[PDB]
Design a protein around this ligand. Structure first.
Ligand SMILES: Cc1nc2ccccc2c(=O)[nH]1
Length: 348
């Protein structure tokens, strides 16, 4: 009752058990054999190791049956329902990427559903108040006419890529967030140079986890797929690049995005896929060099932090496998989430 409507609107939204169920069904998971309440960490941890066993087998060149065994084992562990359609073999990069994408969501779906059942949920206290406390995060509404509000709205407007011409982004709510202990954790990197305010798009069902446990790196068991520069935390300077990872449908055009203080330091600027996790001496990050970059001449120093809100301009790089820039850090302590934005997607 006692929280601002937008802050409340956000809790019910991120803690929706019905939205969690929707995602499971969209991954073709058998909710009769694998309900929301059966999902466990060691089960998803096991599901990662099988995908890593699959990608190793395919690489080492295995036999139909031994490769088929891991496909059966994965589905036996994570009950799937394909109806009358035959179960698709997990024996290729597209097959593993799609299952690895699912586990990421299922990981943050578990972390969220566990929170909901956890705690001394009694009766007198408003469901919102109860759940907002469980995130261990100070969520405060940013005023419409504030300084930061104009900066954040300039950033959204100017960094929307010409390629991403399928929606128009519309800002609904801006929240100044501060995760419990994050500043104490980030403290060793606050002094570091090249600190930037960057974007991070993610599915709505993952935010109760993102605000609960912060932005995280894939576990060692996870297959090394989907991401261009290894297991690390990925950001964009282009809003629409991150906004794409909200997976907003025409029926559900409401999604959430992030702005985190990423302590980049000396960036190991690459142009083509390169798995590392272990950076080179003196480097603190990786920068995926894109053909299009926000105007470096139009940089802003909001709170002594670099904000590349420049209009989309082409960088002088053409020998690169990347359309737009991306940034990766391999230490979760180098991130410090500042804002959470509620965005409307207006499809053409
Ligand atoms: C999950 C995720 N991956 C990304 C990769 C590149 C750039 C941005 C993102 C992002 O925002 N979320």
């Amino acid at each position: 009752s006692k929280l601002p409507k937008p802050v409340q609107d956000l809790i019910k939204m991120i803690f929706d058990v019905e939205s969690m169920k929707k995602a499971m069904v969209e991954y073709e998971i058998d909710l009769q054999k694998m309900p929301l309440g059966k999902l466990s960490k060691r089960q998803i941890q096991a599901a990662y190791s099988i995908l890593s066993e699959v990608q190793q087998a395919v690489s080492q060149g295995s036999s139909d049956s031994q490769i088929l065994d891991l496909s059966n084992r994965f589905y036996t562990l994570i009950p799937h329902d394909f109806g009358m359609k035959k179960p698709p073999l997990l024996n290729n990069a597209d097959s593993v990427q799609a299952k690895a994408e699912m586990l990421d969501n299922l990981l943050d779906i578990e972390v969220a559903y566990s929170l909901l059942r956890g705690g001394s949920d009694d009766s007198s206290k408003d469901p919102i108040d109860v759940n907002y406390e469980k995130l261990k995060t100070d969520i405060k509404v940013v005023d419409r006419d504030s300084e930061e509000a104009e900066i954040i709205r300039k950033y959204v407007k100017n960094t929307h890529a010409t390629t991403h011409n399928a929606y128009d982004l519309e800002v609904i709510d801006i929240f100044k967030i501060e995760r419990e202990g994050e500043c104490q954790r980030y403290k060793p990197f606050k002094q570091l140079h090249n600190r930037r305010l960057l974007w991070h798009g993610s599915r709505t069902t993952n935010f109760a986890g993102i605000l609960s446990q912060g932005l995280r790196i894939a576990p060692p068991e996870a297959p090394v797929t989907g991401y261009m520069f290894g297991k690390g935390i990925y950001f964009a300077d282009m809003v629409s690049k991150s906004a794409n990872y909200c997976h907003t449908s025409q029926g559900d055009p409401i999604g959430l995005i992030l702005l985190g203080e990423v302590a980049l330091g000396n960036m190991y600027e690459l142009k083509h896929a390169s798995h590392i996790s272990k950076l080179p001496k003196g480097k603190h990050s990786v920068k995926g060099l894109g053909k299009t970059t926000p105007d470096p001449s139009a940089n802003i120093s909001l709170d002594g932090v670099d904000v590349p809100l420049g209009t989309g301009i082409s960088s002088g790089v053409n020998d690169t496998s990347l359309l737009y820039n991306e940034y990766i850090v391999y230490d979760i302590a180098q991130v410090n989430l500042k804002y959470l934005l509620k965005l409307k997607f207006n499809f053409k």
